[model samples]
Target: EIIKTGLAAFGMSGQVFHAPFISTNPHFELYKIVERSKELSKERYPQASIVRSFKELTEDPEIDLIVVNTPDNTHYEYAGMALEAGKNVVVEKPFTSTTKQGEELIALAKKKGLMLSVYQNRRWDADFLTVRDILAKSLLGRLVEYESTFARYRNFIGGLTYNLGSHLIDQAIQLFGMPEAVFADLGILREGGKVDDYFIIHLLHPSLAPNVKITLKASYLMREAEPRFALHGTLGSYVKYGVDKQEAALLAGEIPERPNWGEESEQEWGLLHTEINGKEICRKYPGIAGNYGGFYQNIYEHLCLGQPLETHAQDILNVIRIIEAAYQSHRENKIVNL
Candidate 1:
């Protein structure tokens, strides 16, 4: 009854993000992995098969699900091939390089009657979870502004608009749906760097929250990073200063099932300054545990138990579209409407 999964790569994403969850989850079998040169994935999941090429992995009949965790540019090609081979697919973030590519993949998946999803793991981050809860409970009533910053001190970086923006933009879309318009400023601030190392994207949701302003920003040369998330509303404001614990834990080769796996420490908790009822309150907010495995669990439920998919390709398509618009807005120096 378990859904067998094949990973298209054994890189950092494969080793840290995908394999850990796939190998540990009971509903799935880490059936196969595609590693071109090394036996890295084999070292971790000895029971799983490792293929030399993506084509070989797609040709396998045992794989019901194929994870396209390869580089961003190859997502369209690999996911499309997997769907054509009659396997459901899960593509990593920044689904495709172009909106047209995503549209084509979605169309092909529909034609083949297969499930397709995008790995939007950041939606489960502890900081994001806390912010989501704050909004959901209307704790920060009449939310006016939301800002999320994910920066690093790298001397070099990829185009943040897609590399890091994928998660930030997707989070904005998840919280506020598609924006009415987008205004973006992309910069090549890093010295001697050709590609953009910094970007600031504004998602304007006029219809829903006319007064609300959402900013998603990232840079590679940040020496002193800003708060991870900041929200302001009529009632109060919440600001969080740390990244999620799951990525650090996963990178440390810590098992996802380890005790208190994604729990953040009290010192890492976000500060919430707001008023409830007739009283004023300002205190640290405990974050919900982050679970990247939930993404795979949803994949299992949809493919095996006939439940609805949480990260369907159709819903994620808008993210790519918005990114495209943001680029257009950046190039044109005007707000682009969705």
Candidate 2:
């Protein structure tokens, strides 16, 4: 009982993110990849079909699940088409350009009784896993401030709020649930950059946890990036540096199922300084190994074994709602109450 999967594109995402998992995982088949002019995927997945158009791929009766891994803007149209064709879909985040579009797709999926999920690989990042584990253990007791920063030195960028912000926002909401209000400051920092290159979103959860502040930020201008995650609470703080190595490893053409695939170097482990049993504890917390394959694995389980999905599209609707609120707040220069 294998879930035959087709990827809409064979660009970086298909290559580094989707294909590796599908090809490696036994429960799923890397059935098809839509690459317009190149046979790039042929080298790696010779058994897989390479279609030239979205029309051919979506219309195929063989593909049970289609991954809409194309550019961000194309998600809505492509995912809509896939759902219409009676195929379950996995859309890469930010799910869509607007809340309306996301809702439409979600409704359509429901109508078709097809599974829909937003591809939130960041949720499986080593750093993020560590952060979540620490919080779950209440190592950082009564969390006061949680900051997640994804910064890089680049001369160009996309709408930072949607591109990277989606990941950070997803992580925040997963950890803190929905916020009471949102205050955002989005900017175009790169020279001649048509899209936003900087953003700082404040997710205020006054009712959920009084005075608890969750800040998510991203910038293309940072030469020396800040900690990927920093959490402070009454007990102490947990600061982590570096992102998950799964992506870099995948890009390097490493087999995802290989031993220690997503393990980070010891130097990149997070520093956890919190009181334990009334005793001061300060030490480097060993990083967890990330597995993006887990997403597809869950998809397989849900389809085959009726297991619950970990990254359901319906659950992520609030993330898009929050993103919309953040944009409105940025434009109006005020906090938007959710």
> Candidate 1's C-alpha lDDT?
0.86
Clashes of each: 0, 0
Model 2 poorest ten-residue lDDT run: 205-214
lDDT of 1 by residue, 1-338 (tens): 89888989989998899999999999899998888999987667999987899998789988899999998788888988899999999998768777788889888888888988988899889888888889998988899999999968887435778778888988887777778889999999977888778899888874556668989999888889888999999999999986898898899999897768788888999998999997899999987888898899888888778898888887677777887888999999999987
**Per-candidate local distance difference test:** 0.86, 0.87
Per-residue alpha-carbon lDDT of candidate 2 for residues 63-95, written as tens digits (9 for 90 to 100) = 899999888779899999999999999998757
Off by over 4 Å in 2: 71-74, 154-157, 189-194, 206-211
Candidate 1: which pairs clash?
none
lDDT of 2: 0.87
Q: Residue 336's C-alpha lDDT in candidate 2? A: 97
CA deviation > 4 Å runs, candidate 1: 71-73, 154-157, 206-208
